[PDB]
Ligand binder design. Sequence first.
Ligand SMILES: [Ca+2]
Ligand SMILES: [Ca+2]
Ligand SMILES: [Ca+2]
Ligand SMILES: [Ca+2]
Lengths: 673, 673
Amino acid sequence: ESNFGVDFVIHYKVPAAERDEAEAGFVQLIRALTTVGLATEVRHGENESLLVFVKVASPDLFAKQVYRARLGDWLHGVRVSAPHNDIAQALQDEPVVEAERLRLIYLMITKPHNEGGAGVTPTNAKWKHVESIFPLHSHSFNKEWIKKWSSKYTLEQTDIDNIRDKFGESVAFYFAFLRSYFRFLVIPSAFGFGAWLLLGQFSYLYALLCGLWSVVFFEYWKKQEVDLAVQWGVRGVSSIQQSRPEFEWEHEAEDPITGEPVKVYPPMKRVKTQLLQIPFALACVVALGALIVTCNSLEVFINEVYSGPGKQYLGFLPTIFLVIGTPTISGVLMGAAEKLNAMENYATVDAHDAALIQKQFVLNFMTSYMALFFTAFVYIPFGHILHPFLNFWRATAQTLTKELPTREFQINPARISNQMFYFTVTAQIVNFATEVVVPYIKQQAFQKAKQLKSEDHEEEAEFLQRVREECTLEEYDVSGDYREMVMQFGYVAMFSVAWPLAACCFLVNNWVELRSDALKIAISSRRPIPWRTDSIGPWLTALSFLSWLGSITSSAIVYLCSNSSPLKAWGLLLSILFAEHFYLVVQLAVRFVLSKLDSPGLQKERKERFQTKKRLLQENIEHSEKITREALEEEARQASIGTPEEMFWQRQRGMQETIEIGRRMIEQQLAAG
Amino acid sequence: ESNFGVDFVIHYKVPAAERDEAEAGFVQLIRALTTVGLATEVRHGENESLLVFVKVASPDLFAKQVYRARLGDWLHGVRVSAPHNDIAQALQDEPVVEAERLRLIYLMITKPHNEGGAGVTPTNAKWKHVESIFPLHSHSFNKEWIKKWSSKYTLEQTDIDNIRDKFGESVAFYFAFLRSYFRFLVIPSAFGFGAWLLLGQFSYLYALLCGLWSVVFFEYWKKQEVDLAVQWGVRGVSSIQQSRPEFEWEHEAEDPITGEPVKVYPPMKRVKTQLLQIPFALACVVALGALIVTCNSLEVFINEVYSGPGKQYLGFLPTIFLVIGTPTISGVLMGAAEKLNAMENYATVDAHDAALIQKQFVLNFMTSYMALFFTAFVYIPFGHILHPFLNFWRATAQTLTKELPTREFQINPARISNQMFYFTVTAQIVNFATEVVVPYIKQQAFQKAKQLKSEDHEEEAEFLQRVREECTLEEYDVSGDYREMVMQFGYVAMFSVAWPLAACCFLVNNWVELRSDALKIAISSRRPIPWRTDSIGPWLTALSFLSWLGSITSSAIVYLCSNSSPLKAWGLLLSILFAEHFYLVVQLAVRFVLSKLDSPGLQKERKERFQTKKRLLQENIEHSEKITREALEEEARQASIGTPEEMFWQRQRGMQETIEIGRRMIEQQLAAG
Ligand SMILES: [Ca+2]
Ligand SMILES: [Ca+2]
Ligand SMILES: [Ca+2]
Ligand SMILES: [Ca+2]
């Protein structure tokens, strides 16, 4: 029903080996926790673990730290205004939300000891026994949240603000991105269904209208991202995160803006190491891309040119050979990339996580579209370059057992429609299996293992059984649901011209996905620690790269596929050159139009930043004789001791003397004529 | 030698007609001027004019307005910090420069009467008799300035800061731009001379290295523009200018940021009118471009295919027919553009002047490069499409007087070298004539007209003769010297691949031009009113358009000209597509590298904006029992009246009780195994 007012849960695995040192660390832990100012409780959890429940003891002592955290946000420019001069008045204007409370408790348990409470981050390895620090769910809210989101057709802005109030900003930006992406998916589903009825397959008019859509959505999200940023009070929070515990710093120096001592690193030594990302990425497209092509070279031999026995039995040979390789070789390439960003020496935890994405994006670019790059550019337009690869597999299949029967090779034009039919409606359903219900069935099977093996009080018995169940769940990553939506945006921007019902079917997926990822937070993951992010992250560069490449590839397809005369190469370069420059001129139009549209987000900051300069300010016929007072003064001060320029101003004094002298010169100039 | 401490000079033409109303306006003028707080002097000037000399009377009264102007800059976010709390201390930290003094005196004489001093702007037409308000030169400074700049090889940063201190920012940004452009012109003069010796004419390697230069200069200037902005204290001064006196405003409403009543206009009504700039510009390239081509169609008939008498006599027929048309038809197109921006309803004077440039740039794009667009793309690669135009002029010359002798048409490959030889070394010298010495000779001839026609005091006689001479000089426009330097940047970015000694010869021009435009302020123009600009203006979009088009056209030339096999069109599109994307990937590299380089300009603002929040802030084993104090308190407050979750926290209190209970559960879990 409800938690026992508990803020956080520390798992603290205690193994058989190093048992006395874990107990000595257990005394060292809870004596460190009680000095921060939070009440502790230890309970019987798993077979070798001790659930350490913590809440903050004094709310008045806690209200001081909230006031110091809100002041620290405004001191660095994050908050739009200063807090109130009276304590507990700014807490009464806006209260502490459940997300901001769990963030400051987590920063009490995870910060260096000199500047903060206790260093219970497990990455320090002074204690390797702390398994995880995680907050608890409240199942009264999750039953209300899934019921409310499934009942409504759309989501109001106040519904996503409930996610910001309880699950932090970094979770709430995903649902804010997914809602704005689902509503902007209505537009290319409209003429995407229209280009399926009026126009033919591979319409050139659709490829220009889709390239218009991919930049009017992406630029509008950049306007709505900074609008949601200052609305939630989270703006410019790139620099405000604690540094990583693993960080090599050349010399500690003075901070330029902050004026405190901070560990600084020369960025040109990092740009020297950041230059190595290009020899890493070019090894990625060869290690993965030659693997995708070769298993695509297999299927074009088994399916089309083959008339032997067990044709469907050998039809699963390319697929089951592909799903073995791609998690294994990308697992290797994720290993070297993890040693690359560790070598890159990222200070804050956000920049370390974001550049891990840019290495994780290149692999997931190659597991996604390399099956469609080979079909759209090598199989369909000129499959006769594939004939020596068909001459290879014809030689090796003769060595199996007489000659095996082959048909003459014919380019099947329905391949890219059938390949897109996998990625649009078939891959989405099996992903809907793997995202929610296959974890939910696996939670049932792990529950029955507890019943196979088959001390608490009257009210703690169901609660402690819930926390032990909640603890084995993995931490939710908001990166994992960004990868699914950006790769889905890749199919619309690059490859929806080959199958214009893609945006119509991706639309009905994201209505489910907006309520299925909400269900994934509820029952299939423990609550993540509420982090603050000013932006969506590094995905803006990922969305802009697919949008720019979507202009090239969707227009290179529609020249190479619509003829299915024989592919003059000047037409291919011209079909790119007009459409790639059509993307740039429209991007210059949409960026200019939204620049002229008013931003209500930035104005509410600029209104208060002006007005806070005003409140610092507000706390801190008779004028002709004053000129004659000065004219006597500039005489009497300089006549005591130059004198040519002094006498020039004193020929005429006051006003009415200078008028009547000027009146004579109008007479004197007119009298000569 | 020196001025008589005079701040400004009002000319106030008084004609024969409307003479009594001009005298009544003269009383109305100088009675309005004396209420602002400035001493006035009227003197005998030109035959129908009255030189009204003004200075501010009381420096203590003037110091109040400087303090109100410096506070108004900080209140809008322009100034990096607030002024001092003590009056005349912030004037003692930084003094009033001669540029800031003449700006505030000019805003006293040019502002509406309710919010300011007097509306003596002549555009109001309540008085049409005020000819000009202009400050005076100081010839002691100008003799020192021209001598110092001609003596040194380069210019230090402190030399340009002397121009900011006396001629305002908007003049000083041109010399700061020209110095940074002259020093960055060393780079393409280096390999531009190298591509003239090692490589041949039309080198492809030069066209990539020049496109690298045009973006590493332009992005570095955008870094140096915001660096010079906050250094001079002029930053974000786009919104701070007074509105134009001619401005239609739909309804006066509340200002969002400023919170004062201001006249607002809906910007989407302007974007509706801003959409008309494209049907205006496409009429510009046809009215001018068909004029440039037709007079180029004449010269290709007279010079090459003709053997009649008076060949050099008819050789000046295309040139003298061209210099008649282009000032006249662009004078028409400047008239409609002046009615276009007037229809566009620009509020501030900077945005009205900047969008006049973007219409004035399109014409000066077409007077400059249309002679080179026809040569590089129509004459050299396929001159056989020009043969029907040669068939036209062959028909009309037979009707003059027997058949006139024609040679067979041969494409001269030395045309674009001879055409660039005009624009690089020949057009620069005649422009050096027309810029400084032809105005200087014309000032001598206008001086001798005064001696042909052939009342003052002992010291005013040479000074009043100087002011009457200074008044007839035109106001200096900083736009006129930006047009020469941006068009010079067009020849380097677009057309220097055809003649690689262009950047070598443009380098030796800008050493002269940096000291010739400095001489143009001194003797050939009255001092402009010192205006403040945060940016160089709209020329950043002009420099970026030539840099992007410089990637296309210099690479389309080197395919179409190097063959001078027969011009396969797939090579032309590929030579663009690689080099135009080479421009984009290098632009993404240079923008990222300068983003990682530290900006010392923005940090000095962010250091003080943090510290001014700190000064608002600064003016306004024993902790375990406090948890047990709260644990008794949360008991005794809730035991007076829920109770399950209350009793959960009170099973264990303090620290040492919770330790020893946790010590048993390590025993109890290990005892079962
Ligand atoms: Ca899914
Ligand atoms: Ca997801
Ligand atoms: Ca010149
Ligand atoms: Ca100039």
